[PDB]
Amino acid sequence: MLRLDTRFLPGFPEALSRHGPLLEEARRRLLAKRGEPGSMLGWMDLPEDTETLREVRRYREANPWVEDFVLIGIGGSALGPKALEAAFNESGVRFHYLDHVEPEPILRLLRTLDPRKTLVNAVSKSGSTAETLAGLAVFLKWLKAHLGEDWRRHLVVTTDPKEGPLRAFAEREGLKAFAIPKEVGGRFSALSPVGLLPLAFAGADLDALLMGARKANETALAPLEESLPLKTALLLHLHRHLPVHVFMVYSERLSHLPSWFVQLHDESLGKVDRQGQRVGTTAVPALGPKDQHAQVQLFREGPLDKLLALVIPEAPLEDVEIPEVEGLEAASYLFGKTLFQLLKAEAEATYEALAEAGQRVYALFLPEVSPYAVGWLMQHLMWQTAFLGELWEVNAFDQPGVELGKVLTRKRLAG
Amino acid sequence: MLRLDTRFLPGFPEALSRHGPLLEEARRRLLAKRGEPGSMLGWMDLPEDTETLREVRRYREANPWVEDFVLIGIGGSALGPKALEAAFNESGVRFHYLDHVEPEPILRLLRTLDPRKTLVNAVSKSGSTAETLAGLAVFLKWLKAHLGEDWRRHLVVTTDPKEGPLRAFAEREGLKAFAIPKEVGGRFSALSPVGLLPLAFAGADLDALLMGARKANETALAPLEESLPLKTALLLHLHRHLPVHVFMVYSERLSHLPSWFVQLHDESLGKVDRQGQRVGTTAVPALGPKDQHAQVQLFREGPLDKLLALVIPEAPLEDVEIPEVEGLEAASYLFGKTLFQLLKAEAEATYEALAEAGQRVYALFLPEVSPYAVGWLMQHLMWQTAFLGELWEVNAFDQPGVELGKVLTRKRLAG
């Protein structure tokens, strides 16, 4: 059960009632856009597509030879997969993310990977993302050079079902391809094959992941008092006057989740509203307890300009008891305790410390770090973001600001 | 040679001139503090220690059996090492960082690493950091159980030369130990054995790293016009009221540098000044070009409340030509160009786009990503930060805010 804790924000229950109408209206506006072509709300439906999932799995089982999975993708095509694979890799398959174009790290891959054991997954919604095309071209030459005509079995594409150069290339070469639904933006595509394909090779429980996401869907359409997504949307809305929103996760397995959320929040809400005003808060990634040794100092004695969300697990999947050390008595207070016990204590300690310093902070508790709880959390955050899009009167599903950089890049490349 | 570019900040030359006296005094105040025990300015001298790096090299050479290096450390004892090792690993030795206490990831390491090929490095300045003592306890049991009498050779300690439980433990057990100078704080310890030891096993050029840092020391003492650290200190100072400071690096090899800077900036300047006021800006990490697909959208159309610094390399160490692909004509504009050429184009393009959007942005150019250039950059930033400590009238070398969390943690664990 994903649980919202606002022990340090006493006025919330009342503020929720007060803003009930506003929230109901924001939700009404969003839902009224479904089915409308181009509204980009397809991410709502991904958790219900259990058939594509079985298809992804079948393909994975038909290719047990894969030892190295090279995902050539950037942004929405990489952050979700990275976040999920780092947390649920049970298969031992090695994942390499080409979410950049710096030559050296890529040459190292070409020189250390066995072509016969490598599967390249080119991922891009439009299929024309510059970085991905560049990386693909490099890996294609490599594949053909080492595998001859047997290269095609080593390249799988994930892109729009009909449009774009990747789709066309896949059709032309008879390559296996998965689809990113037309109405699903890259930023909201984590639960589509974008995330499902690599997770299948990672041997994660895809069914549990989607089960969690479907539960989040239920909370999104539930009565206000049970609509967690609307509650957290309100929390951010009520603190929209604070420029920074910190997303801190107390888990190493979920070390890549903060980055995924930063993109979700930043790219969705950093927009010009209906009123022509530049809006959006700055999402800042953090991990616990490591960031108690990097950013907490600032949260504690720096400006009171932040709204902090802490994601805390309540149980481990497999704990470890901290053993006694002869000759190291200074650590005796730890002996007998478990690592998760230390993890949880630090999370609770920091949560309190942040509140004691006057910062506005709340927590989202996860029963444990599992596909079910994480799928719930991610889908929840996508809903949160979508609702905020209504409350802030912006288009939460586009990204007008990234176009110029692409044009200027082409210019400098050509002349 | 590091290069500062302020092409999109036309009023900077006048501002530098006008604030000349202020900057000169900030520098004088900092330098006047040297010599005085407890000033925590030992990081200025690390580049001139031409004895310790030899000792580090000899130790490494005497242990060519290491295939896996497990660094148990957090915050200042982990970020510097991660940033450096990720950028300069030439040996292929696999590094594992215990900068957390979540049970599963650690259990995975205990079950997949070969004890005979593993070297454990416990790093902590105080020697009593909770997370590190817990991680060490666990690995100690593991080492003893699988290595017998030869366990001691697989554990090396990096801590204060005289204080703390780690120092005492190392002397009691006859373990190899390296020293973090008394006057060197954790977040300023990257060029001490904290970073030198792991870098040695990574096969990187330690000498070049310190030489580059020495160059930065020179710039810190140079005439104002040539003192890059005082110039960037001014830039951050002139935007001290803006809540956010983005640090974006256009390199994958340096993917861990932003995190290192965030701790350096946040923990040092997020303080209560001498007038009792809360000060400090929020450092936000970013990587190029991947963040053009995640955070740039917000920088482009969101609030103009940031000062952005872009770190851009000017040359690759080894480039890669993007090969033409038969059947992928939509990518022909990339054929013939190189990966670095693309990287550079995107960096310049984004730098300009950010300025076009009205954001206060500047760039720091590195000749290439090398120990020399990066050592220069890191030392430059430490000076920048120390100068800012004077300009903002705060103690940039302590961290009062993290104590409560530790106290509450012990309280929780006890009961």
mmCIF file of C-alpha atoms in Angstrom, chain A residues 7 74-76 79 82 89-92 97 99-108 110-111 127-131 133-138 140-141 144 151-152 165-166 168-169 172-173 243-244 250-254 259 262-264 266-272 277-285 288-306 313 315-331 333-335 337-350 352-353 356-359 369 398-406 408-410 412-415, chain B residues 7 74-76 79 82 86 89 97 99-108 110-111 127-131 133-141 144 165-166 168-169 172-173 243-244 250-254 259 262-272 277-285 288-306 313 315-331 333-335 337-350 352-354 356-359 369 398-414:
data_model
loop_
_atom_site.group_PDB
_atom_site.id
_atom_site.type_symbol
_atom_site.label_atom_id
_atom_site.label_comp_id
_atom_site.label_asym_id
_atom_site.label_seq_id
_atom_site.Cartn_x
_atom_site.Cartn_y
_atom_site.Cartn_z
ATOM 1 C CA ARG A 7 2.908 14.197 9.953
ATOM 2 C CA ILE A 74 18.089 8.883 -24.623
ATOM 3 C CA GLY A 75 15.706 10.780 -22.369
ATOM 4 C CA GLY A 76 12.312 9.100 -22.175
ATOM 5 C CA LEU A 79 15.515 7.020 -17.899
ATOM 6 C CA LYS A 82 17.512 2.579 -16.292
ATOM 7 C CA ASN A 89 17.697 -7.223 -12.549
ATOM 8 C CA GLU A 90 17.508 -10.903 -11.545
ATOM 9 C CA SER A 91 18.852 -12.470 -14.742
ATOM 10 C CA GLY A 92 22.431 -11.258 -14.550
ATOM 11 C CA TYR A 97 22.981 2.472 -22.004
ATOM 12 C CA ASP A 99 22.287 7.772 -23.742
ATOM 13 C CA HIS A 100 25.143 9.927 -25.001
ATOM 14 C CA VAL A 101 27.543 10.329 -27.916
ATOM 15 C CA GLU A 102 30.964 10.713 -26.295
ATOM 16 C CA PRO A 103 33.211 8.401 -28.383
ATOM 17 C CA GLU A 104 35.524 6.811 -25.794
ATOM 18 C CA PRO A 105 32.918 4.991 -23.664
ATOM 19 C CA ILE A 106 31.372 3.671 -26.863
ATOM 20 C CA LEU A 107 34.694 2.450 -28.277
ATOM 21 C CA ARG A 108 35.258 0.651 -24.979
ATOM 22 C CA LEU A 110 32.863 -2.143 -29.058
ATOM 23 C CA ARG A 111 36.196 -3.479 -27.789
ATOM 24 C CA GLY A 127 12.714 7.293 -34.477
ATOM 25 C CA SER A 128 14.845 10.271 -35.525
ATOM 26 C CA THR A 129 16.448 11.352 -32.235
ATOM 27 C CA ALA A 130 19.921 12.426 -33.360
ATOM 28 C CA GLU A 131 21.947 10.808 -30.572
ATOM 29 C CA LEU A 133 20.605 7.465 -34.821
ATOM 30 C CA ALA A 134 24.317 8.240 -34.407
ATOM 31 C CA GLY A 135 24.823 5.492 -31.866
ATOM 32 C CA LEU A 136 22.830 3.025 -33.939
ATOM 33 C CA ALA A 137 24.916 3.702 -37.062
ATOM 34 C CA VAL A 138 28.067 2.950 -35.087
ATOM 35 C CA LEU A 140 25.315 -1.393 -36.974
ATOM 36 C CA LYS A 141 28.722 -1.233 -38.667
ATOM 37 C CA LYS A 144 27.715 -6.339 -39.658
ATOM 38 C CA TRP A 151 23.340 -9.127 -37.658
ATOM 39 C CA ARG A 152 19.558 -8.615 -37.931
ATOM 40 C CA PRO A 165 12.963 6.172 -39.927
ATOM 41 C CA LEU A 166 13.443 3.410 -37.310
ATOM 42 C CA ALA A 168 10.901 1.982 -41.772
ATOM 43 C CA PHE A 169 14.357 0.499 -41.193
ATOM 44 C CA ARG A 172 13.022 -2.906 -44.584
ATOM 45 C CA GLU A 173 15.389 -5.332 -42.844
ATOM 46 C CA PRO A 243 11.203 27.260 -6.473
ATOM 47 C CA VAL A 244 12.638 23.841 -5.602
ATOM 48 C CA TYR A 250 15.939 5.908 0.394
ATOM 49 C CA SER A 251 17.161 2.986 -1.699
ATOM 50 C CA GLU A 252 20.201 2.117 -3.835
ATOM 51 C CA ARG A 253 18.249 -0.317 -6.025
ATOM 52 C CA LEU A 254 16.105 2.703 -6.941
ATOM 53 C CA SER A 259 16.462 11.139 -12.492
ATOM 54 C CA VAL A 262 13.180 14.931 -12.611
ATOM 55 C CA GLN A 263 12.548 14.528 -16.340
ATOM 56 C CA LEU A 264 8.865 13.789 -15.757
ATOM 57 C CA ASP A 266 10.760 19.321 -15.357
ATOM 58 C CA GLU A 267 9.837 18.548 -18.962
ATOM 59 C CA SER A 268 6.112 18.270 -18.235
ATOM 60 C CA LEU A 269 5.579 21.365 -16.083
ATOM 61 C CA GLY A 270 8.412 23.722 -17.048
ATOM 62 C CA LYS A 271 6.169 25.574 -19.473
ATOM 63 C CA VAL A 272 4.487 28.862 -20.401
ATOM 64 C CA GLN A 277 3.719 33.219 -17.730
ATOM 65 C CA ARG A 278 6.839 31.056 -17.352
ATOM 66 C CA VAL A 279 5.948 28.443 -14.748
ATOM 67 C CA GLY A 280 7.252 25.264 -13.190
ATOM 68 C CA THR A 281 9.361 24.344 -10.183
ATOM 69 C CA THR A 282 12.845 22.815 -10.252
ATOM 70 C CA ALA A 283 12.974 19.109 -9.367
ATOM 71 C CA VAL A 284 16.167 18.101 -7.538
ATOM 72 C CA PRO A 285 17.278 14.439 -7.288
ATOM 73 C CA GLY A 288 19.222 8.434 1.092
ATOM 74 C CA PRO A 289 21.275 8.037 3.145
ATOM 75 C CA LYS A 290 24.124 9.151 0.859
ATOM 76 C CA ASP A 291 22.681 12.640 0.371
ATOM 77 C CA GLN A 292 22.642 13.200 4.116
ATOM 78 C CA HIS A 293 26.330 13.592 3.261
ATOM 79 C CA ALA A 294 25.947 16.058 0.380
ATOM 80 C CA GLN A 295 22.674 17.981 0.163
ATOM 81 C CA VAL A 296 20.995 17.741 3.568
ATOM 82 C CA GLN A 297 23.401 20.324 5.029
ATOM 83 C CA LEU A 298 21.859 22.840 2.609
ATOM 84 C CA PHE A 299 18.298 21.669 3.319
ATOM 85 C CA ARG A 300 18.986 22.127 7.035
ATOM 86 C CA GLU A 301 20.703 25.519 7.200
ATOM 87 C CA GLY A 302 20.128 26.974 3.757
ATOM 88 C CA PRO A 303 17.052 28.943 2.527
ATOM 89 C CA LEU A 304 13.504 27.728 3.207
ATOM 90 C CA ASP A 305 12.672 27.496 -0.485
ATOM 91 C CA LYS A 306 12.008 23.771 -0.861
ATOM 92 C CA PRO A 313 10.647 1.582 2.051
ATOM 93 C CA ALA A 315 10.705 -3.580 4.670
ATOM 94 C CA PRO A 316 13.608 -5.331 2.911
ATOM 95 C CA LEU A 317 13.304 -8.294 0.550
ATOM 96 C CA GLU A 318 16.328 -9.920 2.188
ATOM 97 C CA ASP A 319 18.017 -8.318 5.196
ATOM 98 C CA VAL A 320 21.564 -8.603 6.504
ATOM 99 C CA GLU A 321 22.491 -8.606 10.183
ATOM 100 C CA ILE A 322 25.394 -6.325 11.089
ATOM 101 C CA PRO A 323 27.943 -8.740 12.658
ATOM 102 C CA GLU A 324 30.179 -7.900 15.593
ATOM 103 C CA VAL A 325 33.725 -6.802 14.983
ATOM 104 C CA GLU A 326 36.473 -7.674 17.430
ATOM 105 C CA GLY A 327 38.672 -4.639 18.047
ATOM 106 C CA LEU A 328 36.084 -2.155 16.775
ATOM 107 C CA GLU A 329 34.030 -1.375 19.879
ATOM 108 C CA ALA A 330 33.147 2.084 18.591
ATOM 109 C CA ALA A 331 30.673 0.302 16.305
ATOM 110 C CA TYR A 333 25.808 0.110 18.844
ATOM 111 C CA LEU A 334 25.380 -1.324 15.330
ATOM 112 C CA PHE A 335 26.089 -4.970 16.177
ATOM 113 C CA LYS A 337 21.002 -4.552 14.175
ATOM 114 C CA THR A 338 20.316 -5.089 10.474
ATOM 115 C CA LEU A 339 21.256 -3.008 7.456
ATOM 116 C CA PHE A 340 17.630 -2.306 6.608
ATOM 117 C CA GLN A 341 17.042 -1.330 10.224
ATOM 118 C CA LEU A 342 19.859 1.237 9.840
ATOM 119 C CA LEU A 343 18.450 2.342 6.485
ATOM 120 C CA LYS A 344 14.973 2.922 7.935
ATOM 121 C CA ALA A 345 16.291 4.679 11.047
ATOM 122 C CA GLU A 346 18.282 7.134 8.927
ATOM 123 C CA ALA A 347 15.296 7.777 6.666
ATOM 124 C CA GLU A 348 13.038 8.526 9.654
ATOM 125 C CA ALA A 349 15.795 10.563 11.292
ATOM 126 C CA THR A 350 16.341 12.757 8.229
ATOM 127 C CA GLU A 352 12.294 14.572 11.142
ATOM 128 C CA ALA A 353 15.491 16.624 10.899
ATOM 129 C CA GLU A 356 12.824 20.439 12.537
ATOM 130 C CA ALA A 357 14.782 22.831 10.290
ATOM 131 C CA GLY A 358 11.517 24.382 9.114
ATOM 132 C CA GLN A 359 11.416 22.859 5.630
ATOM 133 C CA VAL A 369 11.143 -2.114 -3.168
ATOM 134 C CA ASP A 398 4.721 18.548 -25.075
ATOM 135 C CA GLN A 399 8.257 19.978 -25.048
ATOM 136 C CA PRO A 400 8.496 23.091 -27.309
ATOM 137 C CA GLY A 401 11.716 24.247 -25.666
ATOM 138 C CA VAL A 402 13.931 21.458 -27.022
ATOM 139 C CA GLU A 403 13.425 22.262 -30.716
ATOM 140 C CA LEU A 404 15.890 25.171 -31.034
ATOM 141 C CA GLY A 405 18.822 23.145 -29.745
ATOM 142 C CA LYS A 406 18.163 20.522 -32.408
ATOM 143 C CA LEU A 408 21.236 24.840 -33.980
ATOM 144 C CA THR A 409 22.950 21.445 -33.663
ATOM 145 C CA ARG A 410 22.179 20.636 -37.299
ATOM 146 C CA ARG A 412 26.890 23.598 -36.646
ATOM 147 C CA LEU A 413 27.140 20.060 -38.033
ATOM 148 C CA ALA A 414 26.515 21.086 -41.648
ATOM 149 C CA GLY A 415 28.793 24.142 -41.951
ATOM 150 C CA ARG B 7 29.804 35.539 -24.389
ATOM 151 C CA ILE B 74 30.033 7.800 1.702
ATOM 152 C CA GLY B 75 29.772 11.478 0.828
ATOM 153 C CA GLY B 76 33.243 12.990 0.738
ATOM 154 C CA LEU B 79 31.877 11.122 -4.587
ATOM 155 C CA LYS B 82 33.373 7.892 -8.248
ATOM 156 C CA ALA B 86 34.447 6.684 -13.879
ATOM 157 C CA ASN B 89 39.525 3.750 -15.474
ATOM 158 C CA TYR B 97 30.832 1.528 -4.062
ATOM 159 C CA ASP B 99 27.823 4.401 -0.246
ATOM 160 C CA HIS B 100 24.573 3.036 1.152
ATOM 161 C CA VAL B 101 23.284 0.374 3.539
ATOM 162 C CA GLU B 102 20.459 -1.276 1.573
ATOM 163 C CA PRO B 103 20.861 -5.066 2.154
ATOM 164 C CA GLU B 104 20.133 -6.602 -1.253
ATOM 165 C CA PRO B 105 22.826 -4.817 -3.334
ATOM 166 C CA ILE B 106 25.431 -5.674 -0.697
ATOM 167 C CA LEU B 107 24.241 -9.288 -0.509
ATOM 168 C CA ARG B 108 24.573 -9.450 -4.306
ATOM 169 C CA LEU B 110 28.916 -10.867 -1.261
ATOM 170 C CA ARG B 111 27.512 -13.592 -3.508
ATOM 171 C CA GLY B 127 36.544 6.928 10.980
ATOM 172 C CA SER B 128 33.172 6.681 12.711
ATOM 173 C CA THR B 129 30.670 7.322 9.901
ATOM 174 C CA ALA B 130 27.734 5.000 10.629
ATOM 175 C CA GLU B 131 27.111 3.702 7.094
ATOM 176 C CA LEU B 133 31.194 1.071 9.903
ATOM 177 C CA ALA B 134 28.128 -1.033 9.105
ATOM 178 C CA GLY B 135 29.361 -1.895 5.625
ATOM 179 C CA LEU B 136 32.817 -2.703 6.977
ATOM 180 C CA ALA B 137 31.437 -4.997 9.686
ATOM 181 C CA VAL B 138 29.623 -7.016 7.040
ATOM 182 C CA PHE B 139 32.589 -7.292 4.679
ATOM 183 C CA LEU B 140 34.984 -8.103 7.523
ATOM 184 C CA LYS B 141 32.980 -11.248 8.361
ATOM 185 C CA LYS B 144 37.687 -13.662 7.322
ATOM 186 C CA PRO B 165 38.137 4.051 15.374
ATOM 187 C CA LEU B 166 39.299 3.155 11.849
ATOM 188 C CA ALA B 168 42.883 2.399 15.818
ATOM 189 C CA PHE B 169 41.492 -0.699 14.079
ATOM 190 C CA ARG B 172 45.528 -3.077 15.983
ATOM 191 C CA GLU B 173 45.174 -5.437 13.013
ATOM 192 C CA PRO B 243 17.521 29.720 -5.865
ATOM 193 C CA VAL B 244 19.184 27.479 -8.426
ATOM 194 C CA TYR B 250 28.885 17.492 -21.578
ATOM 195 C CA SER B 251 30.631 14.163 -21.083
ATOM 196 C CA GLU B 252 29.678 10.632 -20.079
ATOM 197 C CA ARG B 253 33.147 9.821 -18.714
ATOM 198 C CA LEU B 254 32.530 12.680 -16.258
ATOM 199 C CA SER B 259 27.274 14.854 -7.946
ATOM 200 C CA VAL B 262 26.674 19.318 -5.669
ATOM 201 C CA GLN B 263 28.113 18.143 -2.333
ATOM 202 C CA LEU B 264 30.993 20.603 -2.613
ATOM 203 C CA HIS B 265 28.659 23.523 -3.320
ATOM 204 C CA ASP B 266 25.647 22.626 -1.138
ATOM 205 C CA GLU B 267 27.439 21.413 1.992
ATOM 206 C CA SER B 268 29.981 24.246 1.910
ATOM 207 C CA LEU B 269 27.711 27.232 1.243
ATOM 208 C CA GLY B 270 24.300 26.092 2.529
ATOM 209 C CA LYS B 271 24.955 27.803 5.837
ATOM 210 C CA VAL B 272 23.918 30.395 8.397
ATOM 211 C CA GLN B 277 20.805 34.601 7.902
ATOM 212 C CA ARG B 278 20.240 31.371 5.952
ATOM 213 C CA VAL B 279 22.204 31.491 2.707
ATOM 214 C CA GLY B 280 23.176 29.249 -0.188
ATOM 215 C CA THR B 281 21.944 28.307 -3.648
ATOM 216 C CA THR B 282 20.676 24.900 -4.730
ATOM 217 C CA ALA B 283 23.146 23.117 -7.003
ATOM 218 C CA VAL B 284 21.350 21.007 -9.626
ATOM 219 C CA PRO B 285 23.328 18.320 -11.521
ATOM 220 C CA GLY B 288 24.898 16.868 -21.756
ATOM 221 C CA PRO B 289 23.398 15.972 -24.126
ATOM 222 C CA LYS B 290 21.026 13.619 -22.247
ATOM 223 C CA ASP B 291 19.572 16.457 -20.170
ATOM 224 C CA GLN B 292 18.519 18.287 -23.338
ATOM 225 C CA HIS B 293 15.930 15.507 -23.127
ATOM 226 C CA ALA B 294 14.931 16.053 -19.491
ATOM 227 C CA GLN B 295 15.813 19.345 -17.808
ATOM 228 C CA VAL B 296 16.527 21.749 -20.671
ATOM 229 C CA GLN B 297 12.797 22.083 -21.381
ATOM 230 C CA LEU B 298 12.400 23.648 -17.939
ATOM 231 C CA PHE B 299 15.459 25.861 -18.449
ATOM 232 C CA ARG B 300 14.024 27.001 -21.789
ATOM 233 C CA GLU B 301 10.427 27.880 -20.888
ATOM 234 C CA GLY B 302 10.354 27.717 -17.111
ATOM 235 C CA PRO B 303 11.164 30.558 -14.645
ATOM 236 C CA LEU B 304 14.348 32.591 -15.145
ATOM 237 C CA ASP B 305 15.617 31.728 -11.666
ATOM 238 C CA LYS B 306 18.865 29.948 -12.445
ATOM 239 C CA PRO B 313 35.362 19.505 -23.646
ATOM 240 C CA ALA B 315 38.658 17.613 -28.054
ATOM 241 C CA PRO B 316 38.212 13.830 -27.785
ATOM 242 C CA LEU B 317 41.037 11.525 -26.741
ATOM 243 C CA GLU B 318 39.934 9.064 -29.432
ATOM 244 C CA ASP B 319 37.061 9.897 -31.774
ATOM 245 C CA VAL B 320 34.630 7.801 -33.812
ATOM 246 C CA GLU B 321 33.393 8.491 -37.318
ATOM 247 C CA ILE B 322 29.662 7.928 -37.763
ATOM 248 C CA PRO B 323 29.415 5.341 -40.599
ATOM 249 C CA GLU B 324 26.776 5.558 -43.316
ATOM 250 C CA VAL B 325 23.903 3.089 -43.012
ATOM 251 C CA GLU B 326 22.262 1.524 -46.051
ATOM 252 C CA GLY B 327 18.518 2.046 -45.711
ATOM 253 C CA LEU B 328 18.699 4.809 -43.102
ATOM 254 C CA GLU B 329 18.900 7.917 -45.286
ATOM 255 C CA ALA B 330 17.149 10.046 -42.653
ATOM 256 C CA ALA B 331 20.469 9.930 -40.780
ATOM 257 C CA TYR B 333 23.333 14.402 -42.238
ATOM 258 C CA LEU B 334 25.309 12.532 -39.572
ATOM 259 C CA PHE B 335 27.264 10.246 -41.924
ATOM 260 C CA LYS B 337 30.727 13.419 -39.019
ATOM 261 C CA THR B 338 32.301 12.133 -35.787
ATOM 262 C CA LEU B 339 30.678 11.343 -32.434
ATOM 263 C CA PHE B 340 32.690 14.054 -30.694
ATOM 264 C CA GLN B 341 31.763 16.477 -33.475
ATOM 265 C CA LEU B 342 28.116 15.780 -32.627
ATOM 266 C CA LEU B 343 28.730 16.102 -28.884
ATOM 267 C CA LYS B 344 30.449 19.469 -29.390
ATOM 268 C CA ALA B 345 27.728 20.722 -31.714
ATOM 269 C CA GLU B 346 25.014 19.849 -29.198
ATOM 270 C CA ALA B 347 26.917 21.520 -26.364
ATOM 271 C CA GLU B 348 27.432 24.770 -28.292
ATOM 272 C CA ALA B 349 23.847 24.594 -29.549
ATOM 273 C CA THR B 350 22.382 24.144 -26.067
ATOM 274 C CA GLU B 352 23.230 29.246 -27.173
ATOM 275 C CA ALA B 353 19.637 28.004 -26.758
ATOM 276 C CA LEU B 354 19.806 28.525 -23.005
ATOM 277 C CA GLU B 356 18.325 32.659 -26.253
ATOM 278 C CA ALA B 357 15.726 31.692 -23.650
ATOM 279 C CA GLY B 358 17.023 34.482 -21.411
ATOM 280 C CA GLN B 359 18.801 32.354 -18.795
ATOM 281 C CA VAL B 369 38.673 15.076 -20.555
ATOM 282 C CA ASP B 398 32.071 22.621 8.482
ATOM 283 C CA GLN B 399 28.621 21.004 8.383
ATOM 284 C CA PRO B 400 26.499 21.724 11.516
ATOM 285 C CA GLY B 401 23.273 20.640 9.828
ATOM 286 C CA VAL B 402 24.075 16.927 9.559
ATOM 287 C CA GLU B 403 24.469 16.274 13.293
ATOM 288 C CA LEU B 404 20.768 15.985 14.200
ATOM 289 C CA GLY B 405 20.166 13.239 11.651
ATOM 290 C CA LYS B 406 22.972 11.158 13.137
ATOM 291 C CA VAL B 407 21.675 11.691 16.671
ATOM 292 C CA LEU B 408 18.103 10.721 15.799
ATOM 293 C CA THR B 409 19.423 7.690 13.917
ATOM 294 C CA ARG B 410 21.223 6.409 17.008
ATOM 295 C CA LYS B 411 18.102 7.177 19.048
ATOM 296 C CA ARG B 412 15.944 5.139 16.652
ATOM 297 C CA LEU B 413 18.339 2.164 16.570
ATOM 298 C CA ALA B 414 18.587 2.079 20.370
#
